């Protein structure tokens, strides 16, 4: 007929480590692989929502090139050891935490103050190095459930909302998804050989699932079709 | 034709063969995928003669190269022809202009 | 992979594969995104993308 | 000469516009040169080598 | 509210000309226009249906590469100009059409002798030219309904029984949509001042509506997204 279409039916999925998937599909048809494979990645970079950190308080710093001498890492790098936390806030939009260290410093996330509904997938994501035996670190943390990509760049304008000195921007990274590709490959089936076959190689920071992405990506595309449909 | 030419094209066609030229002026009397008859004026007319010219284009006769020659009428009925005027374009060739 | 008569390599990009690593292998002055800090390379790609 | 033609035209005098990448979408980081060209096909053909 | 998305919906269909049209789209929200307007693009320009000719019969012709007497094209000529007719045909995937001229003058196509559901949009279309007064010509065309672009050493592949001498075949280019351009820019809706609209300029050959091929360009990518949906 005309209305009929190839769909997929060669659903491979091998998982490299528990954040990694290779999803490989086949028939399609020719040209739609990449169409579909570039829906995805757009989805999955710009539109899943996710809980992320927004803004950090250090207690002794007031400026990102401020130093502190009782952490042997610069604020720059505090704040990337922050911004590649990733959490799993649920029930309300933004939490506040509160981490405060003392001693011996491998401080990683495990030493954040629990909350209850906060959770952290990594525990063992390291946070700071203080070296010092006196030295003591406090610290408040905010994360807002967003979607995308926000830079500190774009949150910079309207300072008014970030008055109190004592907070730096960090970049939101809402959603979780990282290295998020898609190939398109030559696929036979009996004579015909202009059919594709896309194959998708995805991570995550380990909230969710990367089968899980996928599908949350594809139901909210399915979904913003919905008035389209036949 | 092509956009962008040195203006020689005319001549090239032309001189050539294998365009079908018009020998003496007059109107076509009768335009015809495979030949044409047009009517000489009375200007270049000869004594004991009708006066008509005939042009039998050549359609799809092979090449040298197994190409392919065909000849396609460029004039309409009753349109007014003049001596060295184009009447049909040979292979490769539009409205007498070389089209490679 | 290696040429006998010198001994120097033989599998070398020659016209298009140079100039793409070159243009991306490029440093701008203003370019957009200028002077952020990035977590890692994926970050980088991610935010190309 | 060949500005100022283009120019009569609702064309660019540079001779080259902004295309848009058909399988993935974004603008191409540079302008590129774009126009039409007359082509020809040499008396090679594939099925006659193979 | 993160969360929600809000929900794009058809709101205007300007059509310009029998054939250029332009579709609007509103709400978006981000890139989502992007993502959906190349998508729909990528699917408009390959996945249309659409009738065209497949097969041609005159009763003086034997052969492609013939020609017949008092026709001013050749029959490969006619054949090209029968390939571009843009012909809506609906109730079925096979149509004979035929026609029959006489006299000295053009062959437009509203010398088809139409069957009630099978419409013509270009009766202006030009077919051949009659340059004599005692000469007939008499056609018969084949139309049907198809996808994509076949040419015909694929089509001649079916080898069941040999068609008869004079039965000229001729390429089929069914896709109806011949040009899209798509555009996103700003939507004025209540006060979010970031939600934008998708604008989408169709010229096709008139034979399809521009709502009726958006509705399936979107069924197939719900339907091929279907599989995603699923994931094993």
Known sequence: ?230 | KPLVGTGMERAVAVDSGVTAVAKRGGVVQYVDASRIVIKVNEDEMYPGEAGIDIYNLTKYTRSNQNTCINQMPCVSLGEPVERGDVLADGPSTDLGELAL | ?49 | ?50
Not at chain 1, 134 to 158: D, E, F, L, W
Not at chain 3, 4 to 18: L, T
Not at chain 3, 19 to 29: A, E, H, P, Q
């Open chain 4, 1 to 50: 000469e060949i500005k100022e033609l283009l120019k009569l035209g609702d064309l660019p005098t540079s001779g080259q516009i902004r295309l848009y990448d058909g399988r993935t979408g974004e603008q191409f980081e540079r302008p590129v040169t774009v126009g039409y060209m007359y082509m020809l096909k040499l008396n090679h053909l594939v099925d006659d080598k193979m």
């Open chain 3, 1 to 49: 992979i290696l040429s006998p008569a010198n001994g120097e390599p033989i599998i070398v990009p020659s016209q298009d594969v140079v100039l793409g690593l070159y243009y991306m292998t490029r440093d701008c002055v203003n370019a957009k995104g200028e002077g952020m800090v990035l977590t890692g390379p994926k970050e980088a790609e991610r935010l190309y993308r």
């Open chain 1, 1 to 230: 007929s005309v209305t009929e279409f190839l769909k997929p039916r060669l659903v491979d999925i091998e998982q490299v480590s528990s954040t990694h998937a290779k999803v490989t599909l086949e028939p399609l048809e020719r040209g739609f692989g990449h169409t579909l494979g570039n829906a995805l990645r757009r989805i999955l970079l710009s539109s899943m929502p996710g809980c992320a950190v927004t803004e950090v308080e250090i207690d002794g710093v007031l400026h990102e090139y401020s130093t502190k001498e009782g952490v042997q890492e610069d604020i720059l790098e505090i704040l990337l050891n922050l911004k590649g936390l990733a959490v799993r806030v649920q029930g309300k939009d933004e939490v506040i935490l509160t981490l405060n260290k003392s001693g011996i410093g491998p401080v990683t996330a495990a030493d954040i103050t629990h909350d209850g509904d906060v959770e952290i997938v990594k525990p063992q994501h390291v946070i700071c190095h203080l070296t010092d035996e006196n030295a003591s670190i406090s610290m408040r943390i905010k994360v807002q459930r967003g979607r995308g990509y926000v830079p500190a760049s774009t949150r910079i304008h309207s300072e008014e909302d970030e008055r109190p000195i004592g907070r730096l921007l960090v970049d939101a990274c809402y959603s979780p998804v990282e290295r998020i590709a898609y190939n398109v490959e030559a696929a036979r089936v009996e004579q015909r050989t202009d059919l594709d076959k896309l194959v998708i190689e995805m991570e995550t920071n380990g909230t969710i699932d990367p089968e899980e992405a996928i599908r949350r990506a594809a139901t909210i595309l399915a979904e913003q079709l919905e008035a389209f449909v036949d």
